[PDB]
Design a protein around this nucleic acid. Sequence first.
RNA 1: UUAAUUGCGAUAACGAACGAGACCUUAACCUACUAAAUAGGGUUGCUGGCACUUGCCGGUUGACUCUUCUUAGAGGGACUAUCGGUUUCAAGCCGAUGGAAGUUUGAGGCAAUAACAGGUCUGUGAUGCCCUUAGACGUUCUGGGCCGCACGCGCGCUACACUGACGGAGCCAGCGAGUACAACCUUGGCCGAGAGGUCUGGGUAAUCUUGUGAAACUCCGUCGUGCUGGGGAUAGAGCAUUGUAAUUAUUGCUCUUCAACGAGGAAUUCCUAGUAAGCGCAAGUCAUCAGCUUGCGUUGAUUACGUCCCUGCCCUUUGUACACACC
Lengths: 67, 63, 58, 145, 70, 143, 141, 206, 58
Amino acid sequence: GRVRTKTVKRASKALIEKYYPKLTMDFQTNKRLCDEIATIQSKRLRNKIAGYTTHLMKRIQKGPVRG
Amino acid sequence: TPVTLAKVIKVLGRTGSRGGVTQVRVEFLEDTTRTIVRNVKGPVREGDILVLMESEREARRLR
Amino acid sequence: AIISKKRKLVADGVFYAELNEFFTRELAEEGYSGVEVRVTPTKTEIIIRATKVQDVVG
Amino acid sequence: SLVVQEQGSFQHILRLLNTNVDGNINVVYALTTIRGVGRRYANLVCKKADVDLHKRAGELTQEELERIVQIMQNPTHYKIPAWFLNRQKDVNDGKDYHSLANNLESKLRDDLERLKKIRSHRGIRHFWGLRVRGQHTKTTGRRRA
Amino acid sequence: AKHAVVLDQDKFDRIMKEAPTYRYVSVSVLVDRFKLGGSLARVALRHLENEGIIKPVSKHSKQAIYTRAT
Amino acid sequence: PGVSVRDVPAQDFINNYASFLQRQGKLEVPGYVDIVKTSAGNELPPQDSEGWFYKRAASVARHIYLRKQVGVGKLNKLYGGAKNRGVRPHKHVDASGSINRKVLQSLEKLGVVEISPKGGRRISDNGLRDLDRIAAATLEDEE
Amino acid sequence: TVPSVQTFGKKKSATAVAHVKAGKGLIKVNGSPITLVQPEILRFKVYEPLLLVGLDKFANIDIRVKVTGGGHVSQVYAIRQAIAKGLVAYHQKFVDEQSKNELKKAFTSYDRTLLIADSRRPEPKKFGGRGARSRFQKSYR
Amino acid sequence: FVPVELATTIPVEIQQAQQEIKLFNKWSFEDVEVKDASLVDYIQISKPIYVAHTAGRYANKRFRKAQCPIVERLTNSLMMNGRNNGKKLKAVRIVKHTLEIINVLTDQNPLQVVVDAIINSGPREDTTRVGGGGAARRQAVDVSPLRRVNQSIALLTIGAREAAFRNIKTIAETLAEELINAAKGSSTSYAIKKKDELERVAKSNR
Amino acid sequence: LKISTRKTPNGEGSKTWDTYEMRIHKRYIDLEAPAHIVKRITQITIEPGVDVEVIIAA
RNA sequence: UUAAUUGCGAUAACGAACGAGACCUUAACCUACUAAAUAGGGUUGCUGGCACUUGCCGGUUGACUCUUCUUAGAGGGACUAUCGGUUUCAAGCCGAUGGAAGUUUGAGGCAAUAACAGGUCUGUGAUGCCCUUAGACGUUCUGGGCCGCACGCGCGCUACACUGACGGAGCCAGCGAGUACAACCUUGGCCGAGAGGUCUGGGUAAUCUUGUGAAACUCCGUCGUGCUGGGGAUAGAGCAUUGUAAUUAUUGCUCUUCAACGAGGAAUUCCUAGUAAGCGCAAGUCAUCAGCUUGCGUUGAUUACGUCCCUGCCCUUUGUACACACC
Ligand SMILES: [Mg+2]
Ligand SMILES: [Mg+2]
Ligand SMILES: [Mg+2]
Ligand SMILES: [Mg+2]
Ligand SMILES: [Mg+2]
Ligand SMILES: [Mg+2]
Ligand SMILES: [Mg+2]
Ligand SMILES: [Mg+2]
Ligand SMILES: [Mg+2]
C-alpha cells in the first residue's frame, strides 16, 4: 500500500541535494531540519518527507545512488 | 499405506485457476535432499510440515 | 428571550440567509455581492457590499 | 430433595368437559387443550382451586376437578376480578361472560350471523371470505386458507 | 409424549442401583438408558447424593454433571 | 472485620430477604398476587405464584440500599423488558407501576423505606440494620 | 499523605478508574469486593492481575475501582486492565524500578491488553447498508 | 505451598490455583502433548490460559490465527448459526461443560483428548475443482497444517450443532462425545466420517 | 447539529445521503466583581460571530 | 511495483497541470501543558450503618485542595521507525521488535476530461412554449379514494426452539432530542392488571427528562425434542389514548382464538476486523402511528490476505464494408 508520491520523493531528493551535510541519519533530527528549512504546509507531509530523506541517507551509506 | 512428513523449503507461486492452490517445494524430513514439488490447499509457509499420502509423485500447474 | 441556544443560532443563520436572498432579489441592478451581520449591544449592524454604492445610498 | 413416587395408585389418562385432558402434561398446560381456557386464565383457575403447580393433569382427586369445573363456568362467584373475559359488558345481557369448550365457537358463530343480519362491513367481509381488520391485500394470504 | 420420562417406582429403583463406582450420572445420561429426565432426573440423583455416593462437580442452570465419591 | 449488603452474592441475599419477609408475615400483601403480570409486556404471571412478590420487595429494598433515591417510574424501567409484539421487533416496556408503588408503600409501613427530599425514596436506619443482619446471616450460611 | 495513585482501564466504551492506596490489601469494584463482579465465567479475567504476579504484592496495596460505560464483558476487561496498571504504577512511584519491570514482564508474557489499551473502535455506519460494510440486497430481475 | 490472605479475603480454591501451575478452567495446561509431527506450532497449547475468552487481534495479519489458544478457536466455532451468533459467554460455558464431561469419562486431561480429536479429524489430501475448461472433474492436492487444523475445528462444531437440532443432549455433551470418538478414531463421529469420505474422494481422483 | 438529506431533489437514482453538520462552541467564565467593572470589560472585546452573554448577580 | 498514469525504471522526448495523493472532518494516544460547585475526585466537617481498636460501606455541593478519569483549547506523536530477509540490491513487498497507532493507522467529506436525449417542468414567485382561464386544469368545503384482490415479482419483519422457551432475579451503553406564546421533554407523589389518569414539578438544557439502570445478555428455577409450554397469523369481545372525525380494526392494553411454517427448489444478495452477524436505542417524518431511515452503541465470529475460472470494467495487439458506431 505505502508508496511515496512525486511531491514527497522529488522534494526529498531536492533536500538531499541541497543539504547532505546537516541532514544526517536518524529521523527526529531530520524532521526538525526539514521543519527549519523547507516551507512545508502540512505536518504529515513534512513528516513523510523527513522519513524519505532518512531512507535516502540510509541507502547512501552503502554506495552511490542514481539521480 | 505409508505416510511421509514433508518440510517446506520454498513457496513456489500461487497456482490453480481461482488461486485456491499454492505450489510448494518440499524437502521431506527423514529423507532430506529430495526436492519433489507439490500443490497445496490452504495457507502455507516456509518450514511447514505437510502430511501427504504419495511420497514420489509430481503435481503440475492446475489449469 | 427564552429560546434554546442551538436553536437561536440556527435561527440567526436562517435570518442571514433570508437577508441575503432579499438583497439578491432587490439590489441586482446595483450589483449586490455580500452581506455582513453584527449583533452588537443595542443595534444590529448590516454591512452591504454592492458595485453601485451611490445608487444604493439614493 | 425427595422424589414423590406413586407406582400407579392415581389413575392417568383422563377426560374433562367432553374432550381429552391427558397425563404427563402439567395441571395448567393441559387445560389449554380445552377451547376457551387459554393460559393465564387457566393458571388463575388453578390458583383459585388451590392445586400444586408441580402436578400432572393425569393425577388429581375428583373433588379438586369438580371445584375447577365449578370455577370455570361461573367466575364472578369467585375472587376472579372478571374483567378479563370474552364477553365483558356483553353483546345482549350486560353481564361478565366467558364461554368455554363447545360453547364459545357457537357463540362466535351466532355473533357472526347477527353481524351479517345487521349488514355491517365486517359481516360483508366474512361473507366474501376476506380480511376484516383493514389488512390491505394486494398480496398476503394467497391459498384461500 | 414418547415416554421414558413419566414417574414409576421400578425406574426409581433401577436408578438407585446405578450410582456407586459410576462415571456418567447427568440428566441427558439418565434419559439415554430409557430412564427419567427434565427436573426429575436431578431429583433422583439428589436422592442418592443426599446419602453420600454421588458428588456434584458442575451446578449450572439446565446443565449439571456429577461424579461418585472416591 | 464487618459485614454489609454490598459484600454479598446478590441472588442469595435476595432469597434470604424473601425468606425473612415470609417468616415475619408483616409487609401488607395488596391482594393482586396470583392475578397480575408484573411487567405489562409479559406472557405469564410468576411461576411460583404463592409469594415471589416478597422476593420482588426484597429486590427493591436491595436496590434502594445500593442507590441514593429511587422512584416508581425508575423501578418500572428497571424491571420491564422486551415485549414480543408479534411479527414486529421487540421494544423496552416499563413494568407494572402500581405493583411497584404498592411494594414501596409496604416497605414504608414496615419501616425499611423512607420518603426523601428532591423526590423518590431512600432507606431507613432500621431497614439498613435489617439488611446488614440479613447479609451477616447469608455469610454465615455460606461459611 | 498516604502513598496512592490513580490509574484507569479502558475497553471499547467502558472506563474503570482504580485508586491504588497504601494499607491492608483491599480489592473492590464499584464498592463490592473482587470476589463478586458476576458475569461469573469471566471472573478469572479480573483475577489475572492478582494471581499472575501473586498475592504477595497485594498485602500493602488497596484498590478501589469505579467502572462506567460499555457493556458487561467490556467493563470486566477495563477493570482487569486498571488492576494491571495500578500495581505497576505504584511500583514506579513508591517501591522500586526492578520490581516494576518484573511485574511488567509477568503481565506482558501472558496477554497484551493488560498494559497497552486496545486499539479497536467501532467503524461508523454509512448509507445504503445496515452496518458499516454490509449493503442492502440488490436485485436484478 | 503457602496461603496468605489480604483485607478482602479470597476463596481458598483461587488461592490454591495460582503460583505453581496456571490452570485452565480448573486444571493444568501442562502435560497435554501434541502427538503428531506437523500441526505443531499450528495447535497452540503451550502458553497457559485461564479463560477461553481473550480480546485478541487474531484476524489482523496472516498467521495470527495460529497463535490463538485452541480452546478459544473451538468456542468461536461453536458460536455459529445466526440465532446463536455473538454470545461468546454461552459458547465458553458450553466448552467448560464439555471439558467437565471429558474429565468425568475415561479421565485424562480433556485438553489432551481435544488435541487428539483436532489431530485426527484434519484431512491429509483434498480435491480442488480444477477443470481445464469448465468440466466438473477434480484434482488431488496436499493440505496445509493450518487448513487441516481449521477444517477439523469446524467439522466437530458442525457435528455438535447437528446433534443439538431437536435433542435433550445439550450441545456440550454432544461435543464431548464427538471429541471422544475423534481421539479414539471411531467412524461413529460425523467429522471423522467426513474426513474419511474426503480421503476416499482424493484417492479416487488421483 | 446534524441533518440528513437525500442528495437528489426528485428521488430517482442510487440513494445517496448528505451529512450537513453545524458545530456549536459554548464556553463559560466565572467572575467575582462589581457589575459595572464586568460591564466595562464586556462593552469592549466584541468580535462578529461570537455571542457575548452575561448572567449577572447571584 | 502500487489502492492509484503510485513509483522504480526503460526511453524522442523534456519539464508541467488537472484527477490520485496531499488536504479536511472524524476515530484512536497524551500521569506534558491550560481548566472547572453546568465534569469528576481526594482528605475533612456533620452524619447513617457496621465490625466494634485504628478499619469497611454510606448520606449530605458543610470546608480545603486536586485534574488521573471529563470536557476541549494549544501542542506533540508515525515517518512503515529499528533490525532481519527478499527484489535490476530499485520502487517496493514479507517477517520480527518497540509502540496508543504499522491494512492509504480506522472511517468518510471533496473528487478530473468527456459525456447520457438517465431522473426531475409533483422543491421552487427556476422555467420556454402549448393548453386552460368563471358550469374553470385557479381554488375552496364535503365525503370517498390513494389501503380495493383470481394473481405475478421487489426490499423487509417474524419465525420454524433445547446455542431454546417461559418465569424470576442480576443488571451495563453510546449517538441524540427537548417549550413562553405556547403547550416541547416530562422525573417525583397518589389513583389503575393494563393502557392510562391525575396533581405537582425540573429543564430554552454537560445543570432536569437521563446514570435514557436499552435490548441481546448472565444467575437459579418450570417444559424437556410432541406443529409441544416452538411459533404467532387470522378472529371475538371489552377497556384506554390522539385528534373535529378511528367502520375501511389509527394506535396502546386485557382475556380468548390458536393458522402457515421441522431451516426453504430454479436461483441469487452482502461481506475480510471491532468488520459479518446478533441485539436494542436514536433522531427523521410525527397531533396520532415503525415491521422503513439516517446515526449510535452493545455482543462479537467463521475464512481468504489470493486469482483471473465465472461476472463486469479497463488497457494492448489485431479485423472492420460500422463512425445515428452491432439495437
Ligand atoms: Mg422470540
Ligand atoms: Mg530492511
Ligand atoms: Mg483515506
Ligand atoms: Mg428521457
Ligand atoms: Mg407549468
Ligand atoms: Mg432500498
Ligand atoms: Mg444524561
Ligand atoms: Mg396453542
Ligand atoms: Mg399512517
